Amino acid sequence: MASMERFLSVYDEVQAFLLDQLQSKYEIDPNRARYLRIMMDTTCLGGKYFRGMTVVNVAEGFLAVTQHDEATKERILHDACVGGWMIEFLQAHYLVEDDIMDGSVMRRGKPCWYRFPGVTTQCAINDGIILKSWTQIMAWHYFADRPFLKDLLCLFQKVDYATAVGQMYDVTSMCDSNKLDPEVAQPMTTDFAEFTPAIYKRIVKYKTTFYTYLLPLVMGLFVSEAAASVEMNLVERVAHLIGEYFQVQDDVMDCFTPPEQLGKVGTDIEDAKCSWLAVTFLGKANAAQVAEFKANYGDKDPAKVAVVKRLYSEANLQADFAAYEAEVVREVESLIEQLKVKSPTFAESVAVVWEKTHKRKK
């Protein structure tokens, strides 16, 4: 796609500025500059760029239906790219830490950043922190004169906070709430009482929906200066729904999608994560099925993992997924329909975003 290459060109423009600043104002040596360049490329590139490209196509939508000088058209497009990358970089930040947390071995077909021989966990933690720091630097540089600044930084902060809170919920999802004690080591849940749709929804919302759909959609609105034209309660509502779906997809892909296609090696079962599959299974399984699940979940043992994957297949889970997908298509159509009232151009943007998500394989 031609549009994806134009977005990727602003990355090179962003990377060159970021590395020159390091050299000119932070006294970095060539080899450490090289290291961070490699770190940037590995962590930030290789993905679908769904999040970056959403802020671009929300922005383009308005550009087709708005009178602007050629120069303004150009600057809004450029703004959409920097906004895109900020998000991309913000995700990169979260991925790096997520991988050390979930103990993953592979991201986007290459090894996980911390698993690079010359990196190790002790560098990666800081590398991630720099990735987040970058988002703010490229904000204060590029958007220094822009009206939408205070508002962009405020949303960024808040979206970021939700993500950290969501991450906290997720990494402690295999614990019993009432047992949580910083002084006593945490045992897995034996009863799985916190594997409810409710508690799962709560997790997904904060860890996924804010940075994945809310942020790019509203960021496209900011760069366009079109926040006022749409009803923000709908955007929050649509973003949390497509966001929920996007994470449900990610969960099934973890178990049933081959790594070569996925680019990721599954880790949920071995980590006893409160995934949609675990929750949905427990949502329909019988007494014998449940007991066998309890005796097998949360182990790195290839046999116990296989017993669970068989338990999922037998429970006919891809039937439950198609019934969930059917109900989401309804509610997304609904909300897109609602969005036409005030902003037809943003309503289609959401129709396109939903389409690309509802279609993904990796």
Contacting residues toward ligand NI9, per CB under 6 A = 94, 98, 102, 167, 170, 207-208, 250, 254
Q: Could you give the CA distance from residue 85 to residue 91 in angstroms, rounded to a whole number?
A: 9
**Residue 312 neighbours by CB distance under 10 Å:** 21
In the bound state with ligand NI9, the residue whose beta carbon lies nearer, of 91 and 224, is: 91
**Closest of 105, 153, 113, 148 to residue 130, by C-alpha:** 113
On whether 320 is known to bind a ligand per the annotation, the reply is no
Q: Is 250 in the site for Mg ion (CB under 5 A)?
A: yes
Q: Is 271 in the site for Mg ion (CB under 5 A)?
A: no
**By the 8 A CB rule, do 194 and 276 touch?**
no
Cβ 157 to ligand NI9 shortest distance, Å: 17
In the bound state with ligand NI9, the residue whose beta carbon lies nearer, of 261 and 334, is: 261
H/E run at residue 80: helix 70-102
On whether 102 is known to bind a ligand per the annotation, the reply is yes
User: What angle (nearest 5°) sits at the alpha carbon of residue 196, between those of residues 192 and 197?
Assistant: 155
**By the 8 A CB rule, do 278 and 195 touch?**
yes
H/E run at residue 14: helix 2-25
Residue 208 interface partner, choices Mg ion, its own copies, ligand NI9, none, CB cut-off 5-8 Å depending on type = ligand NI9
Residues binding its own copies (CB under 8 A): 22, 26-29, 31-32, 34-36, 38-39, 42, 97, 100-101, 103, 116-123, 125-127, 129-130, 133, 136-137, 140, 149-150, 153-154, 157-158, 160-162, 164-165, 167-169, 171-172, 177-178, 180-186, 202, 206
Cβ 68 to its own copies shortest distance, Å: 27
Cβ 310 to its own copies shortest distance, Å: 28
Bin 49: left if φ > 0, else alpha if -120 < ψ < 50, else beta. left
